[PDB]
Amino acid sequence: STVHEILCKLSLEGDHSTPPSAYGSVKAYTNFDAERDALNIETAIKTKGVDEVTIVNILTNRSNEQRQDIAFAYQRRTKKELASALKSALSGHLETVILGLLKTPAQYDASELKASMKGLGTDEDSLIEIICSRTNQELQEINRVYKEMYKTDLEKDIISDTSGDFRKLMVALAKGRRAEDGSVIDYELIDQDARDLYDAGVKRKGTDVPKWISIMTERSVPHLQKVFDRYKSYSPYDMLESIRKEVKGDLENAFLNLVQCIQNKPLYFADRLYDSMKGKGTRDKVLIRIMVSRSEVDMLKIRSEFKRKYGKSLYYYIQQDTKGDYQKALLYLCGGDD
C-alpha cells in the first residue's frame, strides 16, 4: 500500500531469486535493522584502533542479502562505500574474509575466478574448484556478472589462461548448460554411458578425453551418480581411480574435482577444508573462499561429512589453525561445534 511496497511487488519479476537453503550455517538475522547495523559498523570503524570485534559479530551473523542492505544504508549515511571503508580499516586475512562476505555470491565467484587467472601464473586449483562445484544457475549468473565486472567474457579469459583438454573441460563446464534433473531414470543410457566411459579410458591405450568431457559435462548429476555406480561393473577401478590412471596434471585434477562434486559435493568441500589446514601453516585462500561461499549453501552437510570422516569438528580444525578476530570470523561462518 506504500510506494516502496508497490515498486517492490512490481520489481520482483517472476523469479524470486531462489528459495533459501536449509543447510546453510548462516541464517537471516531475525530482528534485522540495516540502519542500526550501518551506524554501529561506522562507529566501530572510526573507533581508535578499529573495533574489529563488533564488525565481525555483526557481519558474520547476517545473511548476504542483509549485508547488501547494510552496505546500502552505510553508503547513504556516510556517502562512502562500505567495502572501501572496511578495506582501509582492516588488514590480513580478516580483511579477505570480510570483503569476501560483502560481495554477492556471483560477484564473489567472479572476482575469485578473475584472481585465479590474473597474472601469468594461473591458479588452477581455485579455477577448478569454482568451475567444477557450481550449478547451472550459479554459473549463468556468474557469466553475466563476470561480463559486467570485467568487460570480458569468462570463457575468453579461460581460453586465454588454459590449454588442451583441460581448457576444453573448463570451457564446457563454465557454460553451465548441464541437462537438468529428469523425472525418469534412464537405465539404458546409464549403462551405455558406463560402457562408453570404460571404452574411452581403461579399456584402451591412451584416453578418448572428449568422450569423458561430453558425458561428464552434459548429463544430469543424479544420472551421472548412477553412471559412476554402473561403471564399477565394467571397470576394475572406480571413476576416480580410473582418472588417476588415465590422465595427469591439470586435466587429472579437474576430472577428480568434478567427479567428487558429482558424487558428494559436501564431502568434496570437507576434504578441501581438511587439505587447506592439515599441514604446515594454512591455505588461507581456499579456507576463506569455502567458508564464505558455502556458508549459506551446505555448510551443515560439510560439517557433518567432516566430523564423520576426520573424527573432530571443522570448528576444531579452524580453531587450531587460525587465531584472533580472523579465527572468530571463520568460526562464526562455521556456525558452531560439530
Binding site: T2, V3, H4, L7, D33, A34, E35, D69
Partner: protein, 95 residues
C-alpha cells in the same frame, strides 16, 4: 527493506494527502473547490501569500480542471504539485 528512502516517502505523502481531502465530500476520488482550498490552506501554508484573492483561486481551479468537470482528480492534482515544485526549482536555479 524498512525505513523507505526519502523520495519514496515523499511520493507516499503526495499520494495520501490527496485522499486525505478528496475523501471528505462528494466524489471520494476527486477534489471540489472547498476540499482543494482546505488542502492548500492546511497542507501548504508556506506557499500562500499574506492575502488570497478568491478570483485567482477560481482561475487556479479552472486551470487545474483540464477535462472540465468542476473537480480535480489525482492526475490534475499531480500537475498542480508539478507546478509548485517547478516554482521551487525556479527559486533554486537562479537566485
Amino acid at each position: 527493506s524498512h525505513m523507505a528512502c526519502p523520495l519514496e516517502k515523499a511520493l507516499d505523502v503526495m499520494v495520501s494527502t490527496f485522499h486525505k481531502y478528496s475523501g471528505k465530500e462528494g466524489d471520494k476520488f476527486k477534489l471540489n473547490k472547498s476540499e482543494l482550498k482546505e488542502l492548500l490552506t492546511r497542507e501548504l501554508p508556506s506557499f500562500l501569500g499574506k492575502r488570497t484573492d478568491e478570483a485567482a483561486f477560481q482561475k487556479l481551479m479552472s486551470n487545474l480542471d483540464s477535462n472540465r468537470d468542476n473537480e480535480v482528480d489525482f492526475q490534475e492534482y499531480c500537475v498542480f504539485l508539478s507546478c509548485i515544485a517547478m516554482m521551487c526549482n525556479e527559486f533554486f536555479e537562479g537566485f
